[PDB]
Design a protein around this ligand. Structure first.
Ligand SMILES: CSC[C@H]1O[C@@H](n2cnc3c(N)ncnc32)[C@H](O)[C@@H]1O
Length: 264
């Protein structure tokens, strides 16, 4: 609400700085992500404080991982498309920059499927599936801290019946030829996980494969590379779909490819 923020802060800021105040922000649970121009640095705390008041949030992080500008408690529960996502906003990446994809996941699975989430996080991609798809889900998350939330989110959504969780590196995962669908929501050279994926996959399984490719190499990549690694195993793969996502600089998109693999 500009007027109120303006009314309060104009009382302490040069009108010149006033004009520069944040016009937008991101909100996650009761935590605010707030972007700030350089020339406002001296006043950052007071600014975050009044925005906290009028926007009704407990804590403010700098949007620009994140600097604490006001408050202390960065844990919160964020509700999206009917799903409760508990997280620690400061320590765990989560962005409505990717809400479309989480919505999509709500519309892909059939209740029979076994799905394996190789980079579960707090359940970003898997929860939508366990709730709307009604399919079974095994979810793997390496970080013990992240893992706590993943677990908690399973209860918060009343799916503990059809969704399990392991705090381990996906590489050490025992299952093989068990997955009808695989989630690979990771972006740091995800291609190094293709082999384990192919191992976990059943013949014909669908894989949601995320990664970050320079647009220079598009649309050859990232598929070519996926294709060739798969060849190393005598398996074949068909590209069903390629969506672009949080395309981000410099010069590299974040894409997701929907692929089917054939174990011959
Ligand atoms: C939240 S999006 C990416 C997620 O995958 C997790 N992750 C990264 N590498 C692995 C791995 N090798 N096995 C299981 N989870 C992983 C991260 O800790 C994070 O929560």
């Amino acid at each position: 609400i500009k007027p109120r923020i303006r009314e309060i802060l104009s009382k302490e800021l040069p009108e010149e700085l006033v004009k520069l105040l944040p016009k937008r922000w991101v909100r996650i649970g009761d935590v605010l992500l707030l972007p700030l121009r350089p020339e406002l640095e001296p006043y950052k705390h007071r600014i975050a404080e009044v925005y906290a008041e009028v926007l009704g949030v407990k804590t403010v992080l700098r949007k620009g991982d994140y600097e604490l500008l006001y408050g202390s408690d960065t844990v919160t529960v964020h509700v999206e498309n009917g799903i409760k996502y508990k997280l620690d906003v400061a320590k765990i990446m989560f962005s409505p920059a990717n809400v479309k994809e989480r919505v999509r996941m709500a519309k892909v699975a059939k209740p029979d499927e076994l799905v394996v989430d190789m980079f579960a996080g707090i359940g970003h991609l898997s929860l939508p599936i366990a709730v709307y798809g009604k399919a079974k889900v095994i979810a793997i998350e390496k970080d013990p801290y992240t893992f706590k939330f993943l677990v908690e989110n399973i209860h918060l959504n009343k799916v503990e019946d059809r969704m399990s969780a392991y705090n381990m590196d996906n590489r050490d995962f025992p299952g093989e030829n068990i997955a009808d669908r695989i989630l690979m929501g990771y972006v740091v050279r995800t291609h190094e996980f293709i082999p384990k994926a192919l191992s976990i996959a059943k013949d014909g399984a669908i894989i949601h494969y995320h990664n970050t490719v320079p647009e220079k190499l598009m649309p050859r990549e990232p598929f070519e590379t996926f294709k060739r690694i798969t060849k190393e195993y005598g398996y074949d793969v068909e590209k069903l779909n390629e969506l672009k996502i949080k395309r981000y600089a410099p010069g590299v998109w974040h894409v997701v490819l929907d692929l089917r693999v054939f174990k011959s």
